[PDB]
Design a protein around this ligand. Structure first.
Ligand code: CLA
Ligand code: CLA
Ligand code: CLA
Ligand code: CLA
Ligand code: CLA
Ligand code: CLA
Ligand code: CLA
Ligand code: CLA
Ligand code: CLA
Ligand SMILES: CCCCCCCCCCCCCCCC(=O)OC[C@H](COP(=O)(O)OC[C@@H](O)CO)OC(=O)CCCCCCCCCCCCCCC
Lengths: 142, 95, 80, 34, 163, 73, 742, 73
């Protein structure tokens, strides 16, 4: 799966402005950009507070947090049945593809995915903190 | 382009994209005419930061307040005026 | 950020992945349950610590465990 | 009191100057990036 | 399809702000653009001098008419010294703020883009030496303004309604 | 010393007060224990304790304070 | 088209669902796995929106529940009238109202509680009542207990009638949704037919019953030989000798020679010197005028005869450049959401109750009401608390609407959307004004405390120090005192004795009302009131505006309205739900109303209430120390809380001992609330686990598993007990103090 | 509770009227009135509109502690 590139010619939804939007964090640290395809002009609710009309086609919306991107994407998926994907954008122009890392949503199991953080024992079989005294590691890290 | 269409995201213009604008930052350089005196008289503060200005401020606040508290007269400051009436004396005859 | 761990008691119901608001968990192939899948947390650096994944796990005690810590920028959920 | 001026000296220092220096130094220290 | 006075910040609906008459009226915007804090091309020292002059001059009054010695014959001197002490404390505040915020040798991070998009030069006030010069000018101007207010009020004794 | 000469009718003094915020009524209200200015009346029992263990004069207490400074050093 | 629409027999009248507790909801209808179920059964019983999504069924439930509430209120009123008929000294109080304490409750002699039957006067022993019912019945022209009995029987009949009406309109003929959505017809009927006709009817009563009986009472006639109201209606010559204009007999009304009715339709103002209440001629003219006004106003909206206003078209036509579509889409909001209507009506009812509290003491509408200081204080405090609770409830239901009933699709660029879109600016500025008010009021109090403690009384904020005179309120009082001279020339007296003029009404040997002076203390206390109100508004408005989403949790609408938190992430999301904002706004409303009632009590006991002697010397209950003691927090602690609480704590062994008992018990309940407020839930769950082990060791563990209260339930219990304890402490304290000193 | 008991017992012992404690300590209204309300009269009069005395500092600290308690709330 080849990640898509972030096009800079994608029109944004019709929005009248809000006090909940990009702030100094967006210009010093990072922000996010969500893109989705819509079949018709319909009203959705902005995750930052308000309402907007999505374009009849490609859309491009700037967010300040990843959680807002997931909220808008979940509403789009379960309400408008719209596929979406977002990116993390840095002040230096670096764009990172985020949500469908392999093109398939995380709810569906996909081959080629590595098991990270999986422990091969029961949760109650953890080592006691006393045995790991003065060792710079945690019981769950074993 | 940022303003060519309804697009508001552009990697070539990240300051416009992120809203890093200066709303009232006028850059007109002609404000004052006679300012040689102000440059001349201000050498202890400018381009000193932690070395000269801070030490001078600490010394001139400590010495200033010490002098004021040590040389204040009775009328201006009541704590240094001292008691004037007789002791009120406490209960059970304890003094 | 926070530390998220998955245990072999997982049954591959995917309910922890759907409850995650920052897309930290994902389902990977596995052979220890009927569902032939197990949860995993490859991108915990985005975890905020809500433990909504913990509330959605149906096992007696949780197959997914969030331990908190660090409290970085993404962890604190700050937009400024 | 042997030295009545000595309270009038010390109380202002430990009351205003010592806190000023202490808080300035601690603010400079806790805002270092290193 | 009406007039719709209110507009988003620079036309961007996804920036956290608005265009209101309070924000960007021609008169309000002209007033704010010519304040010494927003004259980026002018040296920080002179802007600091102006700011300190104004602030000490306005600060002298409250201390004089509300201080503990406002009923005494040293009311003016006490108020002026209180204003000068507040100016000195704020000078220490500015110095420590500059020490913590700015590091020597770094470029200014102030916004260098106008609303139109002229891409002017960055303001030098947001630099270590710029802030040091600003603090020195503010100290000098604050002391000067306190002295001027004391002279006008008491040494010269101009007729004023309340004092 | 005054307390020791007459314990049942002398109030112990903790330390002097130098509050620039006091008014004259506050200056004269807190002048107790035969002091020349505002003082605090001790309620820690140090006067009784030091009188019991043999300390009698202010020089004894000063010597004890210097000795304890040396001990802390 | 406005028409009557009902459904026949929608719900069968059966006890089958009575045996099933949680029938109304799918979750609770299964059964009690845990003890939480029981609490949930009582927390979702009246949440009709949660039972089903059908708006018709919700509307029917709401209508029938309103009928049930009306029946309950009728039972309560019938009980009050019954207790006035039998267990009261109402007639003795009629004979001598200035020296007999009203009483309508008599205790049984069981455990020594018979001491509570105090000597109220008139050969009667009982609890001294402070509800003002005696004065209300005196105003209504009631002279015998037989009339109270017949009123109580009618009240029972009306309660049964309302109960039957609720049953009929739920189970037999239930209106359809179109019937409920006829808001124009409802407004026309409730303005012309409910308020206008009710005011007209009460004006008729006053003209024909209250005025003659009350003027005979003011003349000193013994109530026994005062002719009955029907003798005034029938023998109109008997009514005309009191007011000659009745001899004209409706001719002036129809010839438009209305000035001939000036005998009993006056615009005097002020107070009746004999009774200390408002003139009932002024009240009759008032009620007639407002009846005419409401009957005119109720002909404004178009139902089905043309001629009128469509509220939808009125709203859609009001928009401007600073707003978007303006009032577009609000008609659907207010005709399809019950919670929005409840929020508006609760806010208006609370503000209206506060207006009532402020206006009933400045113009006592009932005879011998002002001189009954206990009744005045009780009425003010009661209605203040009712109003505050209603306002907080309005905030709660606005939040509920925003969470559940809000539809973004039909609300675009209108007023609600735009308010949602600059909530950050609103809350920022409201926070700033709250901080500024808190500083420049309470810091002024702290400044006064410090300068008083430092021996610098000249540096304080008082009348003998730096003065903060309320010049605007003083100017308003001056303007209102001179209103009859130039601005309302057809007025005899000003609106109230509180404005000014040097007039003092003194029924018996007490003081009814006098010009209330405003100084630095009043400036300070009003700014304290403003601070508290703005902080309460901040909490509630921040809860409402951020109910759907915020920068912390962008999907707070999915979480719901009543949820504990979202987790310990993002630094901790404790109390992010709008329910928690209401939970804190309850505390802040408590503080606001408490300070308001304390200010009222101290100001009245200090500057208004008192006794006047034969010479003309007026002494006050406290002694006019509000101007110099209310400026200091120590003054509040000592001259008000410590000095005026001497009677509640010394009430033991007397008829007021119940007030001391409840004073201490309310203290207890408040302290008890503190642990539900301070503690968590895991601790109690683990303690319950240990107790369950103890029970299991003896095979006595229940199958319904004991669980600790939920987090939201813990907060609800804490706030409920907190408010109950505080309000009951004040209730006991005021009642004991004002019964002792009056 | 411990210090309240100690203090009231010793106030009524030192004043010589122990009957007040013996009669009033059996019910909580006695604790509120004869100990808390009764013994706070001189405390709250430390400073008043008519002047101030040496107990003004303790009145100010009393109110200060009340304020810090509420901020903890
Ligand atoms: C911990 C012990 C202690 C404490 C609480 C105080 C408290 C006080 N002193 Mg005293 N003092 C002390 C020891 C102490 N003193 C000793 C050992 C000396 C001998 C040098 C003095 C000599 C002294 C003078 C000459 C005067 C005071 C005065 C005062 C008052 C104003 C504060 C001030 O100016 O300090 C000044 C204090 C010093 C110069 C002594 C140095 C500081 C000592 C050694 C303690 C420092 C360490 C201590 C553990 C604190 C740790 C900080 C924190 C972690 C708690 C205040 C009541 C003034 C007064 O009477 O006003 C009415 C005044 O004029 N002090
Ligand atoms: C415990 C330490 C302490 C001490 C020693 C003082 C001392 C003083 N305070 Mg108080 N104050 C304190 C803590 C303290 N304050 C705290 C914590 C607060 C906050 C609650 C206040 C709030 C407060 C107020 C609100 C006021 C005072 C005022 C005063 C002054 C009394 C009036 C006077 O001197 O005549 C009149 C004053 C003068 C003749 C000279 C004052 C100006 C001199 C020059 C100040 C020294 C400035 C110097 C350059 C910098 C030194 C400090 C720096 C190193 C940080 C006096 C200097 C009064 C005053 O006059 O304020 C200025 C006043 O109105 N104080
Ligand atoms: C005897 C006549 C009768 C009978 C058999 C029924 C039977 C039924 N009704 Mg109907 N109903 C009646 C009279 C009757 N109702 C009347 C008179 C009214 C008008 C108020 C209603 C209004 C009504 C509504 C609005 C609804 C029902 C519903 C129901 C069903 C379930 C009710 C249930 O189990 O809750 C039993 C509940 C109770 C016994 C609680 C009684 C609470 C009373 C009303 C208030 C008492 C307040 C009290 C004085 C103060 C308490 C505090 C104090 C102790 C300090 C069932 C078919 C519900 C339904 O169909 O479900 C979908 C429904 O929504 N009824
Ligand atoms: C709705 C408001 C209201 C309120 C708050 C009260 C309150 C009171 N009334 Mg009033 N009353 C009211 C309405 C009200 N009443 C109405 C509408 C009527 C007309 C019917 C009356 C008629 C009335 C009479 C005639 C009397 C009272 C009395 C009383 C007092 C004692 C109550 C009593 O006898 O219960 C006693 C308790 C019970 C009846 C409960 C028995 C059932 C329990 C559960 C045990 C059963 C066990 C087992 C199953 C058998 C009390 C102050 C009495 C009073 O004040 O005497 C001095 C009295 O004599 N009331
Ligand atoms: C828990 C609810 C509650 C309770 C227990 C009480 C209890 C009491 N109220 Mg209060 N009150 C409340 C809520 C409550 N009130 C609210 C919400 C309002 C605002 C509408 C009022 C307004 C109010 C007034 C104005 C008066 C009382 C009075 C009384 C006393 C009853 C005497 C009586 O029967 O006269 C019943 C009341 C009257 C005969 C006069 C009422 C006149 C009003 C204007 C008519 C109501 C119009 C309309 C139906 C209300 C909705 C208006 C809205 C659509 C705009 C008693 C102390 C009376 C009092 O203190 O007597 C000493 C009194 O004069 N109350
Ligand atoms: C002149 C006509 C009229 C009058 C007087 C009223 C009066 C009232 N309505 Mg309204 N209503 C009307 C027309 C009218 N309505 C129309 C046309 C509609 C349909 C659009 C509605 C729809 C409506 C709803 C949806 C609700 C009300 C409610 C109420 C009551 C509110 C409680 C209150 O403050 O009452 C103070 C006065 C009293 C308590 C006096 C007792 C009631 C007497 C008997 C008057 C009843 C008038 C009645 C409408 C006549 C028809 C009944 C008849 C067949 C026997 C009040 C009794 C609310 C309520 O509480 O429901 C019970 C409520 O929820 N009404
Ligand atoms: C709804 C309120 C109401 C009601 C039911 C009545 C009813 C009555 N009035 Mg009253 N009246 C009222 C309001 C009311 N009045 C008001 C507001 C005024 C002031 C304008 C009057 C002024 C008035 C006068 C001056 C007279 C009546 C008379 C009458 C009686 C004969 C007229 C009639 O229509 O019957 C009747 C008992 C007449 C009467 O008493 O004849 C026996 C009479 O002479 N009325
Ligand atoms: C016209 C008035 C009115 C009406 C019709 C409603 C109607 C409703 N409210 Mg609203 N509300 C009101 C006023 C009103 N409220 C006011 C004044 C407040 C401020 C306190 C609130 C605050 C509020 C909140 C915060 C919530 C509601 C909820 C609800 C729903 C009830 C569900 C429930 O659990 O109730 C069942 C009934 C109870 C839980 C009451 C139990 C008894 C209470 C808690 C204590 C009684 C105190 C008592 C006087 C103490 C002394 C006696 C004692 C010694 C025995 C329903 C839509 C809930 C809702 O819709 O959730 C989605 C909800 O969360 N309301
Ligand atoms: C006495 C107890 C107390 C005090 C003082 C406060 C103080 C405050 N609360 Mg809190 N609160 C309390 C109890 C208290 N609360 C309790 C019990 C609850 C539970 C219901 C709450 C719930 C609560 C909420 C939910 C909210 C507040 C808010 C506020 C603020 C009001 C506005 C403001 O900041 O300016 C006024 C500030 C004060 C009056 C604090 C005292 C300042 C004095 C006057 C000056 C002292 C300074 C002096 C110079 C000394 C300097 C010290 C220096 C030497 C170190 C303020 C921080 C609101 C807020 O955020 O602000 C808008 C808010 O939303 N509080
Ligand atoms: C200083 C601000 C003075 C606002 C004076 C004022 O009332 O402005 C009134 C202003 C004018 O809007 P219009 O009334 O023309 O809009 C038509 C309305 O009928 C629609 O509701 O309304 C607003 O812009 C929103 C509120 C202003 C912001 C209020 C902040 C305070």
């Amino acid at each position: 799966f080849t990640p898509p590139t972030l096009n800079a010619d994608t029109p944004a939804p019709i929005f009248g402005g809000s006090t909940g939007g990009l702030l100094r964090k967006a210009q010093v640290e990072e922000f996010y950009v969500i893109t989705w395809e819509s079949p018709k002009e319909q009203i959705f609710e902005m995750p930052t507070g308000g309402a907007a009309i999505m374009r009849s086609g490609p859309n491009l919306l700037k967010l300040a947090r990843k959680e807002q991107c997931l909220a808008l994407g979940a509403r789009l998926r379960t309400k408008f049945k719209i596929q979406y994907q977002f990116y993390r954008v840095f002040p230096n122009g670096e764009v990172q593809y985020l949500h469908p890392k392999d093109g398939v949503y995380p709810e569906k199991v996909n081959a080629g995915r590595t098991a990270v953080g999986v422990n091969n024992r029961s949760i109650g079989q953890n080592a006691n903190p006393a045995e790991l005294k003065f060792a710079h590691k945690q019981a769950y890290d074993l | 382009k940022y303003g060519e269409k309804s697009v508001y995201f552009d990697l070539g213009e990240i300051d416009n994209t992120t809203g890093n604008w200066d709303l009232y930052g006028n850059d007109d350089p002609n404000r004052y005419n006679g300012f040689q005196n102000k440059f001349f008289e201000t050498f202890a503060g400018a381009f000193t930061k932690r070395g000269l200005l801070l030490k001078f401020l600490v010394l001139g606040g400590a010495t200033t307040i010490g002098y004021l508290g040590s040389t204040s007269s009775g009328d201006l400051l009541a704590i240094k005026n001292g008691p004037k009436q007789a002791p009120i004396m406490g209960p059970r005859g304890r003094k | 950020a926070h530390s998220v761990k998955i245990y072999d008691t997982c049954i591959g119901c995917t309910q922890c992945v759907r409850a995650c608001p920052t897309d930290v968990l994902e389902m990977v192939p596995w052979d220890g349950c009927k569902a032939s899948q197990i949860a995993s947390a490859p991108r915990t650096e985005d975890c905020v610590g809500c433990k909504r994944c913990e509330s959605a796990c149906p096992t007696d005690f949780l197959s997914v465990r969030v331990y908190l810590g660090a409290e970085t920028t993404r962890s604190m959920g700050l937009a400024y | 009191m042997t030295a009545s001026y000595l309270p009038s000296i010390f109380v202002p220092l430990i009351g205003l100057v010592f806190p000023a220096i202490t808080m300035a130094s601690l603010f400079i220290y806790i805002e270092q990036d290193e | 399809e009406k007039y719709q006075v209110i507009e988003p910040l620079n036309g961007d609906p996804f920036i956290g702000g608005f265009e209101t008459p309070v924000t960007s009226s021609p008169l309000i915007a002209w007033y704010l653009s010519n304040l010494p804090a927003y004259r980026t091309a002018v040296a920080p020292l002179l802007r600091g001098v102006e700011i300190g002059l104004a602030h000490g001059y306005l600060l002298v009054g409250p201390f004089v008419l509300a201080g503990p010695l406002r009923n005494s014959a040293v009311r003016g001197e006490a108020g002026s010294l209180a204003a000068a002490g507040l100016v000195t404390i704020l000078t220490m505040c500015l110095t420590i703020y500059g020490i913590a915020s700015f590091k020597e040798g770094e470029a200014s991070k102030a916004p260098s883009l106008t609303l139109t998009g002229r891409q002017k030069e960055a303001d030098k006030l947001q630099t270590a030496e710029g802030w040091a010069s600003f603090t020195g000018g503010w100290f000098f101007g604050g002391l000067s303004g306190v002295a001027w207010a004391y002279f006008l009020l008491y040494v010269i004794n101009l007729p004023y309604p309340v004092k | 010393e005054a307390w020791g000469q007459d314990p049942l009718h002398v109030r112990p003094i903790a330390h002097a007060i130098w509050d620039p915020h006091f008014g004259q009524p506050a200056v004269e209200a807190f002048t107790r224990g035969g002091a020349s200015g505002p003082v605090n009346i001790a309620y820690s029992g140090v006067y009784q304790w030091w009188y019991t263990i043999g300390l009698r004069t202010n020089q004894d207490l000063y010597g004890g304070s210097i000795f304890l400074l040396f001990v802390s050093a | 088209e406005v028409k009557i629409m009902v459904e026949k027999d929608p719900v069968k009248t059966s006890f089958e669902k009575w045996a099933k507790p949680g029938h109304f909801s799918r979750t609770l209808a299964k059964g009690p796995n845990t003890t939480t179920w029981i609490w949930n059964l009582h927390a979702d019983a009246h949440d009709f929106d949660s039972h089903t999504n059908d708006l018709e069924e919700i509307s029917r439930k709401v209508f029938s529940a309103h009928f049930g509430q009306l029946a309950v209120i009728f039972i309560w009123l019938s009980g009050m009238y019954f207790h006035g008929a039998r267990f009261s000294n109402y007639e003795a109080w009629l004979s001598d109202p200035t020296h007999i304490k009203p009483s309508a409750q008599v205790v049984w002699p069981i455990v020594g509680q018979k001491i509570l039957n105090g000597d109220v006067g008139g050969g009667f022993q009982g609890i001294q009542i402070t509800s003002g019912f005696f004065q209300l019945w005196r105003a209504s022209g009631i002279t015998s207990e037989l009339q109270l009995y017949t009123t109580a029987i009618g009240g029972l009949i009306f309660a049964a009638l309302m109960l039957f009406a609720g049953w009929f309109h739920y189970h037999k003929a239930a209106p359809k949704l179109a019937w409920f959505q006829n808001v124009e017809s409802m407004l026309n009927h409730h303005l012309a037919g409910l308020l206008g006709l009710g005011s007209l009817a009460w004006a008729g009563h006053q003209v024909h019953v209250s005025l003659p009986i009350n003027r005979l009472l003011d003349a000193g006639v013994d109530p026994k030989e005062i002719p009955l109201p029907h003798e005034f209606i029938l023998n109109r010559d008997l009514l005309a000798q009191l007011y000659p204009s009745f001899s004209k007999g409706l001719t002036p009304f129809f010839t438009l020679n209305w000035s001939e009715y000036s005998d009993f339709l006056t615009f005097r103002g002020g107070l009746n010197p004999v009774t200390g209440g408002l003139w009932l001629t002024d009240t009759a003219h008032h009620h007639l005028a407002i009846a005419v006004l409401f009957l005119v106003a109720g002909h404004m909206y178009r139902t089905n005869f043309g001629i009128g206003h469509s509220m939808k078209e009125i709203l859609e036509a009001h928009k401007g450049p600073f707003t978007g579509e303006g009032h577009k889409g609000l008609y659907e909001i207010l005709t399809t959401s019950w919670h929005a209507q409840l929020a508006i009506n609760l806010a208006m009812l609370g503000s209206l109750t506060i207006i009532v509290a402020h206006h009933m003491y400045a113009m006592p509408p009932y005879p011998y009401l002002a001189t009954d200081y206990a009744t005045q204080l009780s009425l003010f405090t009661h209605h203040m608390w009712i109003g505050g609770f209603l306002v907080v409830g309005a905030a709660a239901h606005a939040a509920i609407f925003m969470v559940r009933d809000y539809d973004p699709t039909t609300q675009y660029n209108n007023l609600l959307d735009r308010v949602l879109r600059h909530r950050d600016a609103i809350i920022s500025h409201l926070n700033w004004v709250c901080i500024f008010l808190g500083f420049h009021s309470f810091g002024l109090y702290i400044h006064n405390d410090t300068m008083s403690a430092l021996g610098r009384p000249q540096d304080m904020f008082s009348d003998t120090a730096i003065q903060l005179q309320p010049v605007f309120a003083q100017w308003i009082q001056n303007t209102h005192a001179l209103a009859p001279s130039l601005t309302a020339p057809n007025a005899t007296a000003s609106t109230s004795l509180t404005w000014g003029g040097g007039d003092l009404v003194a029924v018996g040997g007490k003081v009814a009302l006098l010009p209330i002076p405003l100084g630095t203390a009043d400036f300070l206390v009003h700014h304290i009131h403003a601070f508290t109100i703005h902080v309460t508004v901040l909490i509630l408005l921040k809860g409402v505006l951020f109910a759907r989403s915020s920068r912390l949790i962008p999907d707070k609408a999915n979480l719901g309205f009543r949820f504990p938190c979202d987790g310990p992430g993002r630094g901790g999301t404790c109390q992010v739900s709008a329910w928690d904002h209401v939970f804190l706004g309850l505390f802040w409303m408590y503080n606001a109303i408490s300070v308001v009632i304390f200010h009222f009590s101290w100001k009245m006991q200090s500057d208004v209430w008192g006794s006047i002697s034969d010479q003309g010397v007026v002494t006050h209950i406290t002694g006019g120390n509000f101007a110099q003691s209310s400026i200091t927090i120590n003054g509040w602690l000592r001259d008000f809380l410590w000095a005026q609480a001497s009677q509640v704590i010394q009430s033991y062994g007397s008829s007021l001992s119940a007030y001391g008992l409840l004073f201490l018990g309310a203290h207890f309940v408040w302290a008890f609330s503190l642990m539900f407020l301070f503690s968590g839930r895991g601790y109690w769950q683990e303690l319950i686990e240990s107790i369950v082990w103890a029970h299991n060791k003896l095979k006595v563990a229940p199958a319904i598993q004991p669980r600790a209260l939920s987090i939201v339930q813990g907060r609800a219990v804490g706030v409920a007990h907190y408010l109950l304890g505080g309000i009951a402490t004040t209730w006991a304290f005021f009642l004991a103090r004002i019964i002792s000193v009056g | 509770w411990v210090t309240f008991y100690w203090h009231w017992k010793h106030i009524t012992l030192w004043q010589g009227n122990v009957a007040q404690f013996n009669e009033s300590s059996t019910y909580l209204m006695g604790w509120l009135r004869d100990y808390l309300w009764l013994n706070s009269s001189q405390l709250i009069n430390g400073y008043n509109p008519f002047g101030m005395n040496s107990l003004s500092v303790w009145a100010w600290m009393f109110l200060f502690g009340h304020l810090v308690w509420a901020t903890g709330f």
